[PDB]
Design a protein around this ligand. Structure first.
Ligand SMILES: CC(C)(O)CNC1CCOCC1
Length: 460
């Protein structure tokens, strides 16, 4: 039985509106409805992993697991295994996997983050799951962010609290938040970003939706505009949206958007919006392809429609050589030339680098760089030719070229990371000086850049 080099992953997000689901929800898991939908010829093919995020979920974990498992069994004739389930209030994530994957999955973590303070603490936040699939780390986040058209800044704040405080993946990666801990990170949920148009334009918006003319609406979508302006979800991807707004519907039909202000809405309008979203961030030069992104048309118990997304995701095998793991492989090395960090900090401390990677027996600290001033005011930390030679555990190029090096630039004074980034070893050549680059972020905000050259020696 060969190990896979690619799996498919289903992501669902559904705000259930505190109502039980209808008797049949199979269209969701089949990626059928509006948008980028899955070919009928694939309907009996199971995805490898199904990750289901709900919000406003009224069901017990047991109730929902029985619906999900019976749904997938009806579709695929496979009895899925439960990898993990975690619930914060009415926000839930379920991870299900094909039985053949049970021994490939390990290091399962779950966590939650509650957002807001006093007033604004009590129902919004995120749940998440991580695990290893053979040699590949996978992370999944289901968030229900602050509601209301005039709270986009709060949503952005909720996002930063979630990525700072959600404790998933390898704790040894102490400088790194969830946006650096995983080969593939999927973040989805009722993110609650709205189409920012005047209230008076409500019937015009509905007209456009009925004509399937989304362009003038997506240009006002707050998540797209906040992402363009680098306010949120920096360095994540989202597939093009080609499905109607998923909120806010009258229940039991999809023929009507309920947008007008009511006591029950706090006297707020709910203009039709793409509240329900799936984004991802994968390490550089790893295969990840979105093969569906859309909404169902036939599940109408909630004021939201479910959203699906599916992905091809590259994965690697759990490599054993005669040498590593449990020692170094002397035929392997990673070298760095002409390297420097450019930082936005207004502070003057010395800095050093830390290199983290599962291809190393443990993380490596550099010497301090030499600080200089850039021509436009910047701090430039020069490492030149001074960075250490990294000694990987395995030298085989079929392993090493699939690996990544995480970099943190840390203050000598405080040992606090000022920026984090990631370099792929998927090079065009070995034993050859090649340019490398990563942006540097901290708390998911851009803080600088790291650039230079790499020289990678493998056993070939
Ligand atoms: C690295 C690449 C293949 O050129 C683009 N892939 C992106 C996928 C999602 O996260 C950021 C990287």
């Amino acid at each position: 039985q060969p190990e896979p080099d690619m799996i498919t992953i289903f992501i669902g997000t559904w705000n259930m509106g505190n109502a039980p689901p209808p008797k049949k929800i199979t269209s969701w898991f089949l990626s059928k409805g509006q948008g980028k939908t899955r070919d009928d010829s694939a309907d009996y093919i199971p995805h490898d992993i199904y990750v289901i995020g709900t919000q406003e979920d009224p069901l017990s974990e047991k109730e929902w697991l029985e619906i999900l498992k019976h749904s997938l069994q009806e579709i695929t004739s496979v009895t899925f295994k439960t990898v993990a389930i975690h619930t914060l209030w009415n926000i839930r994530i379920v991870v299900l996997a094909k039985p053949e994957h049970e021994n490939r999955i390990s290091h399962i973590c779950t966590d939650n983050v509650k957002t807001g303070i006093a007033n604004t603490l009590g129902n919004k936040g995120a749940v998440g799951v991580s695990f290893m699939f053979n040699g590949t780390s996978l992370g999944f986040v289901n968030s229900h962010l602050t509601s209301g058209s005039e709270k986009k800044l709060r949503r952005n704040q909720n996002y930063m609290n979630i990525l700072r405080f959600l404790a998933l993946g390898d704790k040894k990666l102490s400088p790194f938040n969830i946006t650096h801990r995983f080969t593939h990170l999927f973040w989805f949920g009722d993110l609650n970003y709205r189409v920012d148009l005047p209230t008076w334009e409500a019937e015009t918006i509905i007209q456009k939706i009925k004509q399937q003319q989304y362009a003038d609406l997506l240009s006002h979508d707050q998540l797209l505009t906040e992402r363009r302006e680098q306010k949120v979800f920096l360095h994540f991807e989202e597939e093009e949206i080609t499905f109607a707004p998923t909120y806010r519907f009258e229940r039991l039909t999809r023929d009507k958007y309920a947008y007008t202000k009511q006591k029950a809405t706090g006297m707020k309008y709910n203009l039709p919006s793409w509240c329900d979203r799936v984004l991802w961030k994968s390490y550089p030069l790893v295969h990840v392809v979105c093969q569906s992104y859309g909404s169902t048309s036939d599940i109408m118990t909630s004021d939201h429609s479910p959203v699906f997304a599916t992905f091809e995701a590259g994965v690697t095998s759990q490599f054993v050589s005669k040498n590593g793991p449990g020692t170094v492989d002397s035929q392997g090395q990673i070298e760095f030339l002409r390297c420097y960090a450019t930082l936005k900090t207004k502070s003057q401390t010395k800095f050093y680098l830390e290199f983290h990677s599962s291809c190393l027996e443990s993380f490596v600290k550099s010497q301090e760089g030499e600080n200089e001033e850039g021509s436009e005011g910047e701090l430039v930390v020069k490492f030149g030719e001074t960075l250490p030679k990294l000694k990987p555990i395995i030298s085989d190029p079929e392993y090493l070229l699939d690996q990544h090096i995480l970099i943190s630039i840390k203050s000598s004074d405080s040992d606090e990371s000022y920026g984090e980034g990631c370099i792929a070893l998927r090079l065009e050549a070995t034993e050859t000086q090649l340019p490398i680059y990563t942006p540097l972020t901290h708390h998911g905000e851009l803080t600088g850049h790291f650039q230079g050259e790499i020289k990678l020696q493998t056993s070939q």
